[PDB]
Each structure stands twice: as structure tokens, then as C-alpha cells.
């Protein structure tokens, strides 16, 4: 009723990060009728604009409220896995930190035409960095905005960097400079524009909403991809929900269907769409169009645990939580005024934007990312505490002052899986994050040795001056067996999720798409989102997505080639 006898050259399933890039590039001439179906609403919320209000998007209408299956290995828990639900997708709901990983992360991909020398100029082509002059590793004209965080906790960030130095770490002045080693302490840059969040809706989609060849519908949840027997021919969606009409959007001659539904819902939509392993599809009575055993496998996610600790009494009031809430739980009016008049203060802060990369056991690249936060966690599950901080507003209590150190296996060997649990295209997928299931216990050994490392740093003379003890895991967690058991019951997601539709050389029976992002054994079907990532890079995964979506877009329209 909105695609009415109209045909599209590109149908984009999803209105997310990679989608917001692609629409911009693909719609940029005038010869292409681009479509962009987003299940979520429009991007118009003030909680999305303000970095600190990310504590309000967890478990919110703007989130898919996805929970994993029972994880036997994780004290028989379901694991909440945040995912954005709106135009801009997860770039609207994320912690905004800007990472590329290391040059060695893309060379180990092994795929042709995507070595570190291949991907570097797409990273830089997409960037306007406020804090690095232009060079081989930093851009000045690209659509993304990147800056150093404009909040600084003068006492507790500097004691963190001293601590790190006291325990023998060396400073990294730029984690995205591939000409030195990835490891060390320092500040993470954030995807922000003078303290306002610069999601991919803001930086890409929004400035081209006036193009007449660009059609973007929200509320439009796609149910499958029409594949006449192989050649895709459209998608089927509903503008109302599970209780709505089953519309259809047609492709024009030589029109392609781009999957941008994320690493959770794209393999999900692929299995419903007849693309998956026959055995899993035969179980729900789904016909098999292409039998690729890679769909839904290889789910990679970076698992986190934390330690938290209160400061001494003499330092009550110097936490970022003291700069955001007052002693009665109301937002400080001064924090609001700095933010609006000047883009400064606690409200520009996703909190976890200072840290380190450490090698725990002399590995080739760092296995451990530390994120330091000068607020105190109140639950061992970091995400939970963030939700608790949102609900804490105006309750009447003082949030206690202290620091949190989050620890993350950033190059984790464990993999997961996404699958079908119901024939209902509107049901939550079968989702198993798979943490701590690698055969060598390597992920577990990183997080445990992260717990020893964070207590070392908390013991340094620079940090012990501020701290009074340790709340999590607590003084009763001393043995190695007690630390792994603390990790198992508290392990949360640092929210990455890659690899569920991986690319690889021709002759890879494990792969889903090829190095040109088109899935094997289907015509005019391609995937351009975090799914294709064959191997998660040491770092938050949003920037590599944009590079994947830019490269894909010039490739489509003739500006670049791969291999
Ligand atoms: C809480 C959180 C914090 C993060 N923090 C950081 C960080 O600090 N730095 C960083 O670099 N990365 C971060 N990430 C990761 C980064 O946000 C994601 O890796 C990236 O945005 C994924 O982009 P994408 O294009 O793969 O998918 P998404 O941005 O997830 O887009 C997929 C879209 O598909 C839509 N969709 C799903 N099903 C359907 C359907 N049936 N019909 C229509 N549309 C559908 C979804 O609503 C969504 O908008 C974070 C992730 C989260 C969740
Ligand atoms: C914890 C999140 C705080 C968000 C505060 C936003 C205040 C908006 C006032 C204008
Ligand atoms: C931004 C607002 C910061 C408010 C302070 C909240 C109190 C402690 C925060 C600790 C975060 C631990 C790691 C969790 C991050 C990912 C969810």
C-alpha cells in the first residue's frame, strides 16, 4: 500500500548502521529507486541524542529486548543482548567508542581483497576527526564525526592512567594508528559531534532524506525475501506488526536485495527466506533455496565481567555519577547547563571511554580490553547496573561514589549461533552467545587474568589512594575457581556480535557470502552488515561496519573493485 506497482533497484532490509551508509551512497545519483525498510520507529528521541541517556535505551522500546537461550556454561542463565530498534539501528544505542582494531585483525581474515591494506583507505575516507590532523590514518572530510570525549574526570581518570603505568603498561596515544602496537592505556575516541551522538542516521541518512529516489519506511518489519526458483525478487513486510497486512515490495530488472538487518536478524531472516542449512529449515517446513551451512554459525561476541570499588570517604562526590545525579537522585541542573550551552560535562559521556588493551599471556595481539569507569557498579552485570542507573533517577538516594573496571575478551575464541525457534517470522530467534565454550578455556583465562590485572591496578599507590576496598567480586573471591565462578554468574555482553554470515575465499564450504558480499547460490542477494565479518577485530565493532558499508557501496556503483 506504499510500494504500489513500484519497482526498486535496491531494496535494503533494515534501517541500521550499514543501511544508513548504503542508502546515502546508493541514492546519490538519481537513476536508482532505493528502499529502506526499518522495523523500528524514526530517530527522534532525546535519549538517543544525549550520550549519557544510553542508560535509558537498554531494555526500552528502542531495543529489541532480546534474551539468549539458557546457557549451561553461564550458571544456567539467559543473557540479555542489546540491539538497537530504530533507523540508525545500533549506532543509535551504542557506547559510541571509535575502534578499528589492528592491522593484523584484517590480514587474518584471509579473504582476498580485504587485507589491512585494502580496508585502511575506507576507514579514513569515512572520517572527520576533530583531534587528529589528516594523515594516512585519519580523515578530515568524511561523513562520520569522531572526537576525544569532552568530559574528563580530572582526579579518577588521571589516577587510572598512573595506575596502569605503575603496573608497567605503556601509553598508546592513538588506538587506530596501525603504525604502532595496539596495546597500552589511554583514551578512546567517541563517535560524537561536540557531545551529541553522531549515529549513522545523523551522519548519513538524515542529510539525504530529501532525495526523491530514496524511500524509507519505518514500522516496516520484513518477514522474508522472495526468491523465485535462484534469484531474489523482493521482500514481504507488515507496516503494523504481527497483526497487520502482508505487503510486498518488488524489484526492478537487475535489482538487488541488501541485507542490513544485523548479525542477529539477518541470518534469522535468511533462514526464514529459504537460505540456511536444510536440516534446520526442514524442521519448520521451510523450503531450501541455497543450503549454506554457514548461515547462523560463527556468532562472535566479546564477553565482559567487571570489578567495582568505592572511594574513600574523603573523596565522596568526585565520581561521574556525582556529576550527573545529585544526592536526591535528580539530574544536576549545572550538568544540564554545561551540556546544552557547550557540549561539556557528564552528559557527553558513555562512561567507559578510557581504557587499555593488554596481552594477558604474551599473545600476538591483545586478548584483553579494559574499560575504566569513574562510577561504581552496583551489580556485577554491567548492563544491569546501567538500567539500574536509569531507574535510580529521582528515587531520593545518593548513588555511591567509586570506580568500575570492565574486562572484555576482545579477540575471543568462542563462537555462537543464531537460529529458528518458531515458524512465526515475528518470534525472537534462537540465540546462544556461546561465551566460554572454546575448547582451551582461553576466553575464561583472559577474563580471570583480567580480574587479577584489575586488582593489581586497584592496588597501585595511585589508585589505592582513592579506593576503600572492593565491592565486586569482593574479598571472599580469592581462589582461581572462585573467580571463574564469579565470571560465569556475571558475564555480560560488551555488545559486538559479528560473523553470522561470513565471507571467505571461493571453495570455502564454511562461508555464506563471497568477497563481493553476495551470498552463494542466490542471484541479486547480498549482505552488508556486521554478519559478513569473518573474525571480530579487537575493538568495538561499529566503525568496521561503516567501512564494510562504504566499500560495498562504491563497489556496487562502480567506484572501486575488490581483488
Ligand atoms: C548497547 C551496544 C553498545 C555498543 N557500543 C559500541 C561502541 O561503543 N562502539 C562500537 O563501535 N560499537 C558498539 N556497538 C556495536 C555497534 O553498535 C554495532 O556493531 C553496529 O551498529 C551494527 O551495525 P549493523 O549494520 O551490523 O546493524 P544494526 O545497526 O543492528 O542494524 C540492523 C537493523 O535491522 C533492523 N531489523 C531487524 N529485523 C528487521 C526486520 N524483520 N525488518 C526490518 N528491519 C529489521 C533492526 O531494527 C536494525 O535497525 C554496540 C552495540 C550495542 C548493542
Ligand atoms: C542518566 C541519563 C540522563 C539524561 C539527562 C537528559 C536531560 C535532558 C534535559 C533537556
Ligand atoms: C554514563 C553514565 C555513567 C553512570 C555511572 C554508572 C555507575 C557505574 C557504571 C559502571 C559501568 C560498568 C560497565 C558497564 C558498561 C556496559 C553496559
UniProtKB/Swiss-Prot annotation:
Q: Which UniProt keywords apply?
A: Chloroplast, FAD, Flavoprotein, Lyase, Plastid, Transit peptide
Tell me if Plastid is a UniProt keyword of this record: yes
Q: What is its main location?
A: plastid
**Recorded catalytic activity of this chain's protein:** a long-chain fatty acid + hnu + H(+) = a long-chain alkane + CO2; hnu + hexadecanoate + H(+) = pentadecane + CO2; hnu + octadecanoate + H(+) = heptadecane + CO2; heptadecanoate + hnu + H(+) = hexadecane + CO2
Please state the Enzyme Commission number of this protein. Answer: 4.1.1.106
The similarity comment for this entry is: Belongs to the GMC oxidoreductase family.
What GO terms fall under cellular component here? chloroplast; membrane
Report the function annotation for this chain.
Catalyzes the decarboxylation of free fatty acids to n-alkanes or n-alkenes in response to blue light. Substrate preference is toward fatty acids with C16 or C17 chains. Converts n-octanoic acid (C8 chain) more efficiently than palmitate (n-hexadecanoic acid, C16 chain) into n-heptane (C7 chain) and n-pentadecane (C15 chain), respectively, partly due to an autocatalytic effect of its n-heptane product. Saturated fatty acids are converted to alkanes, not alkenes. The decarboxylation is initiated through electron abstraction from the fatty acid by the photo-excited FAD.
* Chain sites annotated for binding FAD: 17-18, 38, 86, 90, 94-97, 222, 542
How is it used in the lab or industry? May be used in light-driven, bio-based production of hydrocarbons. The oleaginous yeast Yarrowia lipolytica expressing FAP from Chlorella variabilis under blue light conditions produces odd-numbered alkanes and alkenes, which could be used as drop-in biofuel.
In terms of pH, how does activity behave? Optimum pH is 8.5 (with palmitate as substrate). Optimum pH is 6.0 (with octanoate as substrate).
- Subcellular location field: Plastid, Chloroplast
GO BP of this protein: glycine betaine biosynthetic process from choline
Note how many cofactor molecules are bound and how. Answer: Binds 1 FAD per subunit.
The domain of life is Eukaryota
Its recorded name reads: Fatty acid photodecarboxylase, chloroplastic
Which GO molecular function annotations are given, in alphabetical order? choline dehydrogenase activity; flavin adenine dinucleotide binding; lyase activity
Give binding positions for hexadecanoate. 352, 371, 386, 406
Which organism's genome codes for this protein?
Answer: Chlorella variabilis (Green alga)
Which metal ions or organic cofactors does this protein require, according to UniProt?
FAD
What does the UniProt record note about how this protein's activity is regulated?
Answer: Activated by blue light and repressed by red light.
Q: Which InterPro entries match?
A: FAD/NAD-bd_sf (IPR036188), GMC_OxRdtase (IPR012132), GMC_OxRdtase_N (IPR000172), GMC_OxRtase_C (IPR007867)
- The reply on keyword Mitochondrion is no
Amino acid at each position: 500500500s506504499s510500494p504500489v506497482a513500484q519497482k526498486y533497484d535496491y531494496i535494503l532490509v533494515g534501517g541500521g548502521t550499514a543501511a544508513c551508509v548504503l542508502a546515502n551512497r546508493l541514492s546519490a545519483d538519481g537513476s536508482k529507486r532505493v528502499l529502506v525498510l526499518e522495523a523500528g520507529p524514526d530517530n527522534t528521541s532525546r535519549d538517543v541524542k544525549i550520550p549519557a541517556a544510553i542508560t535509558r535505551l537498554f531494555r526500552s522500546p528502542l531495543d529489541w529486548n532480546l534474551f539468549s537461550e539458557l546457557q549451561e556454561q553461564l550458571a544456567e542463565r539467559q543473557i540479555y543482548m542489546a540491539r538497537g530498534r530504530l533507523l540508525g539501528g545500533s549506532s543509535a544505542t551504542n557506547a559510541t567508542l571509535y575502534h578499528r582494531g589492528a592491522a593484523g585483525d584484517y590480514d587474518a581474515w584471509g579473504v582476498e581483497g580485504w587485507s589491512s591494506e585494502d580496508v585502511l583507505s575506507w576507514f579514513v575516507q569515512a572520517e572527520t576527526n576533530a583531534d587528529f590532523g589528516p594523515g594516512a590514518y585519519h580523515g578530515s572530510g568524511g561523513p562520520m564525526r569522531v572526537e576525544n570525549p569532552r568530559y574528563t574526570n580530572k582526579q579518577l581518570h588521571t589516577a587510572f592512567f598512573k595506575a596502569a603505568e605503575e603496573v608497567g603498561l605503556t601509553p598508546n596515544s592513538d588506538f587506530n594508528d596501525w603504525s604502532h602496537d595496539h596495546a597500552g592505556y589511554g583514551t578512546f575516541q567517541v563517535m560524537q559531534d561536540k557531545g551529541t551522538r553522531a549515529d549513522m542516521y545523523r551522519q548519513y541518512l538524515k542529510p539525504v532524506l530529501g532525495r526523491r529516489n530514496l524511500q524509507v519506511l519505518t514500522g516496516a518489519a520484513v518477514t522474508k525475501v522472495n526468491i523465485d526458483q535462484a534469484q531474489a525478487l523482493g521482500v514481504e513486510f507488515s507496516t503494523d506488526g504481527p497483526t497487520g497486512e502482508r505487503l510486498s515490495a518488488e524489484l526492478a530488472p537487475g535489482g538487488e536485495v541488501i541485507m542490513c538487518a544485523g548479525a542477529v536478524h539477518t541470518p534469522f531472516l535468511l533462514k526464514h527466506s529459504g537460505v540456511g542449512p536444510s536440516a534446520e529449515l526442514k524442521e519448520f517446513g521451510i523450503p531450501v533455496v541455497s543450503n549454506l551451512a554457514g548461515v547462523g554459525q560463527n556468532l562472535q561476541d566479546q564477553p565482559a565481567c567487571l570489578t567495582a570499588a568505592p572511594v574513600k570517604e574523603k573523596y565522596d562526590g568526585i565520581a561521574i555519577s556525582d556529576h550527573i545525579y545529585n544526592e536526591k537522585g535528580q539530574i544536576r541542573k549545572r550538568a544540564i547547563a554545561s551540556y546544552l550551552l557547550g557540549g561539556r560535562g557528564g552528559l557527553t559521556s558513555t562512561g567507559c571511554d578510557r581504557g587499555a588493551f593488554v596481552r594477558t599471556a604474551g599473545q600476538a595481539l591483545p586478548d584483553l580490553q579494559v574499560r575504566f569507569v569513574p562510577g561504581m557498579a552496583l551489580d556485577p552485570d554491567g548492563v544491569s547496573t546501567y538500567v539500574r542507573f536509569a531507574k535510580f533517577q529521582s528515587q531520593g538516594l545518593k548513588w555511591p561514589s567509586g570506580i568500575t573496571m570492565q574486562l572484555i575478551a576482545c579477540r575471543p575464541q568462542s563462537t555462537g549461533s543464531v537460529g529458528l525457534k518458531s515458524a512465526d517470522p515475528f518470534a525472537p530467534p534462537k540465540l546462544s552467545p556461546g561465551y566460554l565454550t572454546d575448547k582451551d578455556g582461553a576466553d575464561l583465562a583472559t577474563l580471570r587474568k583480567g580480574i587479577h590485572w584489575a586488582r593489581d591496578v586497584a592496588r597501585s599507590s595511585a589508585l589505592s589512594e582513592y579506593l576503600d576496598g572492593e565491592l565486586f567480586p569482593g574479598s571472599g573471591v580469592v581462589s582461581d575457581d572462585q573467580i571463574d565462578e564469579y565470571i560465569r554468574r556475571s558475564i555480560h555482553s560488551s555488545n559486538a556480535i559479528t560473523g553470522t554470515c561470513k565471507m571467505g575465499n571461493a571453495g570455502d564450504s564454511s562461508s555464506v557470502v563471497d568477497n563481493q558480499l553476495r551470498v552463494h547460490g542466490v542471484e541479486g542477494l547480498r549482505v552488508v552488515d556486521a554478519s559478513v565479518v569473518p573474525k571480530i577485530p579487537g575493538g568495538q565493532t561499529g566503525a568496521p561496519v561503516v567501512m564494510i558499508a562504504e566499500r560495498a557501496a562504491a563497489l556496487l556503483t562502480g567506484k572501486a573493485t575488490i581483488g
